[PDB]
Short mmCIF file of C-alpha atoms in Angstrom, two decimals:
data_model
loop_
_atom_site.label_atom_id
_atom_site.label_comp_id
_atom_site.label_asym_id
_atom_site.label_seq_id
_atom_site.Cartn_x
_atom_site.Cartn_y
_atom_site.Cartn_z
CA UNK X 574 -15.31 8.45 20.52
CA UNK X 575 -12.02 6.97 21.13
CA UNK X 576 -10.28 7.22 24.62
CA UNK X 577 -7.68 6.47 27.80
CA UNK X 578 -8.15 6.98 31.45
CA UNK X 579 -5.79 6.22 34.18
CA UNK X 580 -6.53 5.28 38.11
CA UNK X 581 -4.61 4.18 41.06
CA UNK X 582 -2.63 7.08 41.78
CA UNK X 583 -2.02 7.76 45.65
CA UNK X 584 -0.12 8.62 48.23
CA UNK X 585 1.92 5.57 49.37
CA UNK X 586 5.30 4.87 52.00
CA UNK X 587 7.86 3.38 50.86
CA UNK X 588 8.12 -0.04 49.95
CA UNK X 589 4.17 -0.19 49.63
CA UNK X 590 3.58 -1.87 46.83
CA UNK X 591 0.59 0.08 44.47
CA UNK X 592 -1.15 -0.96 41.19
CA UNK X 593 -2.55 1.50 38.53
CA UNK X 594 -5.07 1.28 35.96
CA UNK X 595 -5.22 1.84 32.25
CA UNK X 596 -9.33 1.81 31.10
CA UNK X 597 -9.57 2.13 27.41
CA UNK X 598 -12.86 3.35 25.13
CA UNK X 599 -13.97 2.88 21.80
CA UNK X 600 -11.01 0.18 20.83
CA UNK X 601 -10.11 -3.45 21.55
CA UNK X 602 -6.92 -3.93 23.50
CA UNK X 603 -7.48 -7.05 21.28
CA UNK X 604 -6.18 -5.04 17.92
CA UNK X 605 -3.76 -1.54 19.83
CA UNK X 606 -0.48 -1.92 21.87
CA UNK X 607 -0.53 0.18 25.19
CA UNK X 608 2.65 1.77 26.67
CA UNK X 609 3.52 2.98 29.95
CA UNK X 610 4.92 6.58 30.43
CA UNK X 611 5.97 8.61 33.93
CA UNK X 612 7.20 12.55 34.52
CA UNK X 613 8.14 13.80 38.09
CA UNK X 614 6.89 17.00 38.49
CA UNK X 615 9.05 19.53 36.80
CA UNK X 616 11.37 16.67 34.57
CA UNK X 617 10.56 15.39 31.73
CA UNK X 618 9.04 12.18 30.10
CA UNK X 619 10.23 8.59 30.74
CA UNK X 620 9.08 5.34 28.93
CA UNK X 621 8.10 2.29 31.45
CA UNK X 622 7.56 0.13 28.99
CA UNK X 623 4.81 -1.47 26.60
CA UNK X 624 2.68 -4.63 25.87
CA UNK X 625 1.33 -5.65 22.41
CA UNK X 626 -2.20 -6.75 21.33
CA UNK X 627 -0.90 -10.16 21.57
CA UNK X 628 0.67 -9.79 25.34
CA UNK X 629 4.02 -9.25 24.31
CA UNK X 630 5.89 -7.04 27.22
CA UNK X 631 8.84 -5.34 26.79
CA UNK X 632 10.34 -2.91 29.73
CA UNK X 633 12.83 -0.55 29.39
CA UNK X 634 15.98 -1.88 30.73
CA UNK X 635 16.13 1.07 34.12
CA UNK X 636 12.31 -0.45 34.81
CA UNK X 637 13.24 -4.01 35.18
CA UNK X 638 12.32 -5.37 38.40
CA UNK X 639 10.72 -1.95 39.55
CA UNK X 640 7.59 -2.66 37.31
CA UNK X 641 5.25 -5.33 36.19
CA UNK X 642 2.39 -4.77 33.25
CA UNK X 643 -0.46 -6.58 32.67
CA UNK X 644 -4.07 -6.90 31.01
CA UNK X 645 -7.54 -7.63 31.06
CA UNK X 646 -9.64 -7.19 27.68
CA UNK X 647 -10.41 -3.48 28.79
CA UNK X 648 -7.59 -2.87 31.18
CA UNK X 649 -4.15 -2.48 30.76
CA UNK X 650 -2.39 -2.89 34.28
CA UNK X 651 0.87 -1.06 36.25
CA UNK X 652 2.39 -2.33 39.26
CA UNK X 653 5.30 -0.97 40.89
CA UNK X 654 6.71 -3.82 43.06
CA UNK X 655 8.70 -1.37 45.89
CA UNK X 656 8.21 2.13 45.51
CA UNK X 657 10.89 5.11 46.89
CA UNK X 658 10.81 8.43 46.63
CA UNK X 659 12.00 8.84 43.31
CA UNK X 660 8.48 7.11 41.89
CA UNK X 661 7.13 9.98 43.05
CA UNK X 662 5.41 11.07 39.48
CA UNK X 663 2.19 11.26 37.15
CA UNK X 664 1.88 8.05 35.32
CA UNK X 665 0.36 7.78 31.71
CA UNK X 666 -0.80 5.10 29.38
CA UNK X 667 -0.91 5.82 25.95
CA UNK X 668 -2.33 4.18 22.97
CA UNK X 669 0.81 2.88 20.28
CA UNK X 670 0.06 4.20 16.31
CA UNK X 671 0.73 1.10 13.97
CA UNK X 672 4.09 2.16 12.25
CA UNK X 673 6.31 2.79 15.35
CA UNK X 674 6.44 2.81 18.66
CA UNK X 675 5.06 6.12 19.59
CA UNK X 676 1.61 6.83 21.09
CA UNK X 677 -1.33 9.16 19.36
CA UNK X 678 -4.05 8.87 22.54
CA UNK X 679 -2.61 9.81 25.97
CA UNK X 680 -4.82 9.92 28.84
CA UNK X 681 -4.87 12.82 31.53
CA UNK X 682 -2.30 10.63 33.82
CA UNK X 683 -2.56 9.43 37.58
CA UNK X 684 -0.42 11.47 40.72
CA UNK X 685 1.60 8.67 42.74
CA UNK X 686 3.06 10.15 45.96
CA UNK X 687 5.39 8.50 48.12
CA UNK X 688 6.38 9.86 51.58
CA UNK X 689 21.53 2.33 25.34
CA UNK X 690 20.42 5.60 23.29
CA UNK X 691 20.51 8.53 24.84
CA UNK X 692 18.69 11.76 23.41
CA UNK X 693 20.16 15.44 23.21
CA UNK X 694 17.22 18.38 23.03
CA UNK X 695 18.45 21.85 22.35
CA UNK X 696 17.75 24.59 23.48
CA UNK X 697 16.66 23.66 26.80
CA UNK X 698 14.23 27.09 26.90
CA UNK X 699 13.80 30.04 23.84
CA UNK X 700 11.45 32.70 23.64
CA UNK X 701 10.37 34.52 19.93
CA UNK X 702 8.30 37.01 18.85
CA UNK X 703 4.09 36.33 17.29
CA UNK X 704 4.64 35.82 14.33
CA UNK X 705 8.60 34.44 15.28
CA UNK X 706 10.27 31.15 14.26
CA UNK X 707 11.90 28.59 16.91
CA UNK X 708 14.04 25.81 15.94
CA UNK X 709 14.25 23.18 18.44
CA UNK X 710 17.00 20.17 17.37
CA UNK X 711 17.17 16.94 18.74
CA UNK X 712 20.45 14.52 18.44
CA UNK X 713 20.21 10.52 19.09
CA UNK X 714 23.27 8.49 19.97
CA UNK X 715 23.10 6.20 17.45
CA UNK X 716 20.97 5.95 14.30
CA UNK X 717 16.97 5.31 14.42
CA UNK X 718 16.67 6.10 11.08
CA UNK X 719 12.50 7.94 10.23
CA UNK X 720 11.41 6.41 13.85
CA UNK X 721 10.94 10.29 15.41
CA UNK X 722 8.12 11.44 16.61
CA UNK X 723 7.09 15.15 18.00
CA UNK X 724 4.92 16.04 21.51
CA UNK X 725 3.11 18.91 22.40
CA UNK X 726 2.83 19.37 26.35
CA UNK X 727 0.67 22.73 27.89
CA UNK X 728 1.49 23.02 31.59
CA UNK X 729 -0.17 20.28 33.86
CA UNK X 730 -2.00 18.97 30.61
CA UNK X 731 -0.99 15.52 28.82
CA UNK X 732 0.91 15.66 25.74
CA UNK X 733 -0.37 15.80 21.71
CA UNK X 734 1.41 14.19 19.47
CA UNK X 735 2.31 16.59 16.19
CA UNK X 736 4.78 14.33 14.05
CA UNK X 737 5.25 10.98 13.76
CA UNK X 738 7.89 9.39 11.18
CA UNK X 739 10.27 12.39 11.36
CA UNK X 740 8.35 14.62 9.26
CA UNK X 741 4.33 13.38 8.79
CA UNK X 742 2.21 15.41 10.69
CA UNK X 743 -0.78 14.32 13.07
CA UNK X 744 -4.71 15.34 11.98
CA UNK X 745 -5.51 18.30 13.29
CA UNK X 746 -1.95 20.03 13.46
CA UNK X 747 -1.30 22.83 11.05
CA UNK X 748 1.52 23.14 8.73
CA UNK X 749 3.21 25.44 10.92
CA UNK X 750 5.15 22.69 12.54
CA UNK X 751 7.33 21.12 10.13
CA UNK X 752 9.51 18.37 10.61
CA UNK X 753 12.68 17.22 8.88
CA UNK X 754 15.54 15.04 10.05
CA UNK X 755 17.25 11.15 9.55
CA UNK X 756 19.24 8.83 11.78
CA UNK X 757 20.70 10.99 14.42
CA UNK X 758 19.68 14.71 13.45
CA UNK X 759 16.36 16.04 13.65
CA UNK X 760 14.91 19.70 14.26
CA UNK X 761 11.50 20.90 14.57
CA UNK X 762 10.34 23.75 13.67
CA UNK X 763 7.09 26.29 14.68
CA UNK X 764 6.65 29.08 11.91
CA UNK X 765 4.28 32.07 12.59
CA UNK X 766 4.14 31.60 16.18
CA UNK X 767 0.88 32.05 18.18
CA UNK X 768 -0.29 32.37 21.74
CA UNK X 769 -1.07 28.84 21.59
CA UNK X 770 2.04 27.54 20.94
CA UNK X 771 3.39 28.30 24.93
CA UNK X 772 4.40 24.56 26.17
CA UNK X 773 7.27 22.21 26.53
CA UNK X 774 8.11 20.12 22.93
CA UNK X 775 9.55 16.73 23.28
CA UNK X 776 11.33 14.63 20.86
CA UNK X 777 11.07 10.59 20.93
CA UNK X 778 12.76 7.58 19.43
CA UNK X 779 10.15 5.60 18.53
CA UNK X 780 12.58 3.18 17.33
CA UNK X 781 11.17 -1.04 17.74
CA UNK X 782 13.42 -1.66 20.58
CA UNK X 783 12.83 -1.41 24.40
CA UNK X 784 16.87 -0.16 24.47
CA UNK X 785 16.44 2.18 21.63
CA UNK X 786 12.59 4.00 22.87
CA UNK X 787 13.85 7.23 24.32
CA UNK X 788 12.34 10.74 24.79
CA UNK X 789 14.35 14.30 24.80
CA UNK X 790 14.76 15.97 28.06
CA UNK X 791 12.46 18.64 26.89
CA UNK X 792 12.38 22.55 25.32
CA UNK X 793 10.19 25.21 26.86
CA UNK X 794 9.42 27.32 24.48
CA UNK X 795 7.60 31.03 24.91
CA UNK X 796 5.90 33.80 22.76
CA UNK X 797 7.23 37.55 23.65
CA UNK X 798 4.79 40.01 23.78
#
């Protein structure tokens, strides 16, 4: 069985510098790319920044400075050099697919207290019936062409990917959730709605670029009953 487990998460004052952890299972950090993700409790989802198989970094351009990744041949590493009070978040590590760079193994993420393309996600909350139909559309600054990819997130849970590519859907996920978009207009949407579909969706570029990897600010969606 394949999997991703993060440690190092504390509370810290600031200006304490802290390292985290990233322990992978079942695969060789020698053959996947591993990428860094944070959320703040109650925002949304914000890419750190990713090394390659090959050791190949690449921050986003906010992170520079702030953060420093490394690895081991089991371990992928985060530091962040001075923390404030705005680092205050769970911190995730997440396992890149091969075609883009989006993730398809997330691992349950790590608490750290301490004492340029922008993306456009619409509606920011929408409730419909069992049974109902929610549209959620998602609007990229400049083109990124197929390089989309869809997240499931249940409350204090780490996110599943659903589509990757725009429109190709993830094993497991049922045909319910169909994708459809290209270069700066995409949607997503959930037919015959369930119980199980209560959580916050998230769009990502998963464009090949540090400046161009960006994720949606996030659509709760409900179920009316």
């Amino acid at each position: 069985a394949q999997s991703v487990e993060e440690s190092g998460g504390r509370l810290v004052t600031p200006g304490t510098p802290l390292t985290l952890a990233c322990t992978v299972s079942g695969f060789s950090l020698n053959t996947y790319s591993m990428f860094w993700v944070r959320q703040a409790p109650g925002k949304g989802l914000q890419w750190i920044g990713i090394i390659s198989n090959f050791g190949v970094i690449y921050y986003a351009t906010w992170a520079k400075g702030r953060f420093t990744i490394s690895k081991t041949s089991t371990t992928v590493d985060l530091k962040i050099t001075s923390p404030t009070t705005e680092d205050t978040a769970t911190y995730f590590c997440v396992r890149k697919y091969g075609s883009e760079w989006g993730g398809d193994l997330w691992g349950p993420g790590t608490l750290v207290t301490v004492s340029e393309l922008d993306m456009t996600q619409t509606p920011a909350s929408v409730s419909e019936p069992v049974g109902g139909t929610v549209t959620i559309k998602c609007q990229a600054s400049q083109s990124i062409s197929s390089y989309l990819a869809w997240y499931q997130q249940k409350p204090g849970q780490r996110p599943r990917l659903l589509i990757y590519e725009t429109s190709t859907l993830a094993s497991g996920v049922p045909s319910r959730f169909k994708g459809s978009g290209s270069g700066t207009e995409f949607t997503l949407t959930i037919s015959d709605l369930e119980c199980a579909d209560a959580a916050t969706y998230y769009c990502q570029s998963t464009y090949e670029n540090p400046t161009y990897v960006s994720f949606g600010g996030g659509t709760e969606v409900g179920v009316k009953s």
